[PDB]
Design a protein around this ligand. Structure first.
Ligand code: KQX
Ligand code: KQX
Lengths: 304, 304
């Protein structure tokens, strides 16, 4: 028992981190097989950042300008190319520590672990969700660009995020591993609207099931609701509308606890309308939306 | 910017995890150099657990009864001994992945990362604090025993905790790496009082400094207080009394923000007396005590 904001073990990803320097700029790169992936803004200077012409900036660079160091050892760069907002530096040596891996584009509301890195060295690991507005609320400082987000499926690392920038609001934006930004963001120092965000309803319900499994039951009530009624409440409180697809993915948790999904929706409805009255759920005084139904099952079963 | 409950990268510890089986019981072991450390209750059965005579149970075991598997490969056990509540199994091969390491006994209120494991395989990593009452509020299921807590100082892993048991209250108890329990706990299936716990005041103040650094400032007020006055409030709200030693370790954060420690104490006093009024601090609706002043500085500076 107990329920924590648990990240995947970061070892397989630590073995892929390298430092990439181009001119005066240094950030992190991800070395998988014989390619190093990093944010293309490694080729910019401060003057360039209002609206960089990445194509022109990259044309001024040669393979020898990209300095890649895997901890202590230097990698020899034999090719470079830009794909969307990432650079791919072909190196002459395949990373001996390359795990089995996939590049995936995650959906808003899904969760992943981030290995925050500086100068190619891992600093820490934390779990977070891709917000419905495609931002992440991470913990990143200057030099963290190129740090990645991922999930692990037994021996396979699915890389889903590469960190690119901090918005003026202090929230974070980045790309999938093909360099496509999540959300409307561009890699320019410009003020950029992140859409209206919402609370990930299916994750809050999954977390209420995790609470029941671990003995926090005070919020269970004698009520039920319908998807239509629940969605009027979700609307008022800026929660994502719940669909049958969300009810279906909560099926395992509903079966394990014997609490029908719509009955858990009625508990969530009352918590939204009444608040917590100074009480806590799994050590939190707010409704947590950073655990998916898969995360709750995985944590509550002991998946290695 | 941003502030997360960040754990240390778990790679150096993942390389030390093994599975230990004795008879019908399986748990995790920590393989450092040519020794595997694991909880001594690996030698018990269900009948034995009300009050095991560990000395007698161990006498019935030989080196060949301890099956140790490092992922896929079997280790040859050439010695066994019990030290307090841990067993030390001497193996004929030094772990090639042994990091630089130390065994340390942490103080109540200090934090560490846990790598939860099952059957010698890492499941996830999370950050937590050793409660003032020497329990930890972890996330552990049956089979997680032998999972360890640690901190990392550049290249050195300081192991501070090995998981042994779950109390009937759902909180966790374990030992340092010499097998001494933290707190009054014994490795028996008996109901056991965990002392009265308190909130780690110095950590809450460190976290209020982290909030100011990241822009959450609403709780700052026009007041100041004294250690004596602040401690009357801490007393009433079950917080640890603040000492000059705690004020001194908050010195760096006070210098960075320009907010005198006693002025931050007056903000904490008002939050204790008035609550949050439905507001949040660093995404939390309660006062967080799982970040030490060192953790806040480390996270806010980017230590790898
Ligand atoms: C368009 C663009 C891209 C990158 C940069 C640097 C940047 O944002 N680094 C950063 C990332 N995450 C957290 C804190 C910081 C400072 C500037 C402009
Ligand atoms: C004295 C003693 C020691 C160990 C055990 C098993 C045990 O507590 N395992 C466990 C640990 N952490 C979380 C959940 C579980 C079930 C029983 C009795």
């Amino acid at each position: 028992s107990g329920f924590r904001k648990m990240a995947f073990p970061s070892g397989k990803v630590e073995g892929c981190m390298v430092q990439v320097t181009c001119g005066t700029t240094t950030l992190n790169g991800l070395w998988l097989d014989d390619v190093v992936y990093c944010p293309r803004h490694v080729i910019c200077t401060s003057e360039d950042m209002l609206n960089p012409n990445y194509e022109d900036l990259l044309i001024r660079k040669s393979n020898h300008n990209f300095l890649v160091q895997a901890g202590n050892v230097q990698l020899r760069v034999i090719g470079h190319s830009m794909q969307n907002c990432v650079l791919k530096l072909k190196v002459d040596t395949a990373n001996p520590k390359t795990p089995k891996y996939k590049f995936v584009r995650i959906q808003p509301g899904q969760t992943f672990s981030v290995l925050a890195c500086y100068n190619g060295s891992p600093s820490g690991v934390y779990q977070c969700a891709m917000r419905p507005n495609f931002t992440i609320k991470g913990s990143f400082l200057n030099g963290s660009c190129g740090s990645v987000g991922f999930n692990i499926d037994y021996d396979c690392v699915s890389f889903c995020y590469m960190h690119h920038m901090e918005l003026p609001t202090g929230v974070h934006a980045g790309t999938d591993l093909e360099g496509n930004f999540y959300g409307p963001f561009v890699d320019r120092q410009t003020a950029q609207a992140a859409g209206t965000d919402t609370t990930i309803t299916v994750n809050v319900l999954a977390w209420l099931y995790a609470a029941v499994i671990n003995g926090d039951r005070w919020f269970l009530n004698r009520f039920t609701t319908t998807l239509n009624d629940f969605n009027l409440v979700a609307m008022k409180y800026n929660y994502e509308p719940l669909t049958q697809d969300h009810v279906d993915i909560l099926g395992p948790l509903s079966a394990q606890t014997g609490i029908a999904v719509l009955d858990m929706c009625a508990s969530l409805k009352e918590l939204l309308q009444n608040g917590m009255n100074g009480r806590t759920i799994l050590g939190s005084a707010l409704l947590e939306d950073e655990f998916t139904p898969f995360d709750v099952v995985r944590q509550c079963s002991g998946v290695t």
